[PDB]
Amino acid sequence: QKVTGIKSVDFKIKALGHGVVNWNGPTTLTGDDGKTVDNHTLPKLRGYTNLTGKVKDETGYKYKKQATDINFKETPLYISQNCIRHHLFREQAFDLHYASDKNLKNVLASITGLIRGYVVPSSQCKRTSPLLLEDFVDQLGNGNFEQYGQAGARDSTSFFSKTTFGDTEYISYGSISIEQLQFISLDKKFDRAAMVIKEGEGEVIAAELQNYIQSLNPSLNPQAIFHSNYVRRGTIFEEGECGILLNDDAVKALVAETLERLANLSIRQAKGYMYVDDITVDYNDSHKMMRIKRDESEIINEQHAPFAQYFY
């Protein structure tokens, strides 16, 4: 049967800032003189390449661009999605290194186990992130070659340079996947085992899920129900896993928690900053995905229906 309800929570983020917060590193470039400069650091540029053309066959050397030859409309500034995710969950950046089979209980009952996803070292336990983020792509392009130096030194190793930026305005799109968010596989059948379990542990784990999700919004009534065989709704498949499914209120809490963190996101890094200015949400119950991207008018800001239920 057709799956109905909210499939995914789409959104379009507009951030503001000043300067580069996510750097790419030193690149081999040539100056206005023709000689190659060693250390000129470049930020992350969409589709940028520091090569122009080839040279004679018996050398194979590739000609390098000038450090001042960049078009921020063709190759704009952006913040890697890898950096954005790092700061959305910055408080738990090192926790996964201390995650093991024993304490995996605590990794799950948390924003990292539910939203970030996670991996368990030396284990086959996983959980794919239900949050999907693009890169934050600048719209203003106020970049330019900036020369740097060191006081009290004139030698060649004293002077460095960078491609720096002034005011920035990023735009990005994302989606919260309900299919990934509401179900939690505890079965090694499909290699999705969020954790290895003994019989009877299904009900206790749901309570800890329940407790933590309840602690996100006490005004709501979440529900985490374990079952030995959860099967997907609309498939031609008759095989399921033992897992945990959150009711509609539990899902309403996690979605609202992530949207808040995205709304309050801010990055201070590399002597530059960036904060999330505006965020536009779409509770997509239609068949077309990323409706917010192609057509911004068919958007529905407030939750107008129950979230889709993907498992029996």
Partner: protein, 336 residues
């Protein structure tokens, strides 16, 4: 039938050994993305949308919940829906590539050289006891004084400061000295040691003898010898060992951990970068490739088959999925 997938910010690299088309082992897949691994042969992997990547997306879109290598093996169902159509699907990829360096995470190892966490234990009893001076002083003698000490000589006035760093530095120097030929005046201190310590041999492939293997075995002597003058329990582990120092050499990180509050220093990750020297081009660097664009999949099937596929999608209600790795890929247009 054409299905047009648009994506953005997808990773075009892979860091795991083995393969994803077979069950994942007990301990997991070996991670080959650290600094040392990438230098060696073929650990640096670049990825393009192959056939498998297009099938896993077609199954995913019809709601399947079993690893693609399981759907191909008809593992938990009767038939594989695409077994007939797999020879009937083509695809054109239209990416825009970007080279950035990403700090990836490593989930096992730790650092030894210049690596410790917490406070340096400079007050540990092994350094602040009465036996402490003429015990570590064995590591300060030159090689001539040591060889005469090994022959029952009770004189070790060689005084140095007692603290983890200076000791590990003195063991660094003594480990950096050249090897020595098997002389006849050396052969006797080899009889003395090998009478003390039979089970181990002080030799290399071709009759060489490392100086550090003698300073350490001499320190075990000092431990056994002094056991009559003072109480050494604070200088040994349980079962009469020396922490981080074997009779053949020394283990640095083990020594430093024992004398630093706080665990060993973990390597949290490393940047995805590989610098090789390639003739003609000088030094070329290799980064992580990120792709953004659209991917057009076309299946040559009857229009009825197309309509059956299109409604199997709507039946499953999938939406917004990654593409190969950590992307944002949706379905933008479907042509029957």
């Amino acid at each position: 039938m054409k299905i047009i997938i648009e994506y953005d910010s997808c990773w075009r690299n892979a860091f795991l050994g083995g393969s994803n088309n077979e069950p994942v082992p007990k301990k997991g897949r070996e991670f080959l993305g650290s600094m040392t691994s990438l230098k060696k042969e073929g650990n640096f992997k670049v990825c393009e949308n192959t056939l498998d990547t297009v099938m896993g997306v077609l199954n995913r879109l019809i709601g399947d919940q079993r690893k693609l290598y399981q759907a191909r093996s008809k593992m938990y169902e009767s038939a594989y829906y695409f077994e007939a159509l797999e020879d009937k699907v083509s695809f054109i990829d239209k990416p825009q590539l970007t080279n950035e360096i990403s700090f990836i995470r490593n989930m096992n190892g730790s650092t030894d050289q210049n690596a410790f966490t917490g406070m340096i234990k400079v007050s540990d009893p092994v350094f602040t006891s009465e036996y402490s001076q003429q015990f570590w002083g064995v590591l300060a003698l030159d090689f001539t004084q040591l060889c005469d000490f090994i022959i029952k000589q009770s004189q070790v006035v060689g005084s140095i400061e007692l603290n983890p760093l200076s000791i590990i530095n003195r063991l660094e120097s003594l480990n950096q000295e050249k090897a020595l030929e098997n002389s006849d005046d050396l052969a006797q201190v080899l009889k003395v040691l090998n009478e003390y310590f039979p089970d181990i041999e002080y030799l290399n492939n071709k009759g060489l003898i490392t100086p550090i293997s003698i300073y350490c075995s001499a320190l075990y002597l000092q431990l056994a010898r002094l056991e009559t003058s003072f109480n050494m329990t604070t200088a040994k582990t349980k079962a009469g060992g020396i922490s981080g120092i074997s009779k053949r050499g020394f283990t640095k990180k083990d020594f430093m951990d024992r004398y630093t509050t706080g665990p060993k220093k973990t390597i949290w990750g490393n940047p995805f970068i590989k610098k090789e020297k390639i003739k003609g081009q000088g030094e070329v660097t290799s980064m992580m490739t990120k792709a953004s664009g659209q991917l057009e999949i076309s299946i040559d099937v009857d229009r009825d088959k197309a309509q059956e596929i299109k409604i199997l999608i709507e039946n499953a209600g999938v939406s917004s999925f990654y593409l190969g790795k950590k992307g944002l890929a949706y379905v933008s247009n479907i042509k029957l």
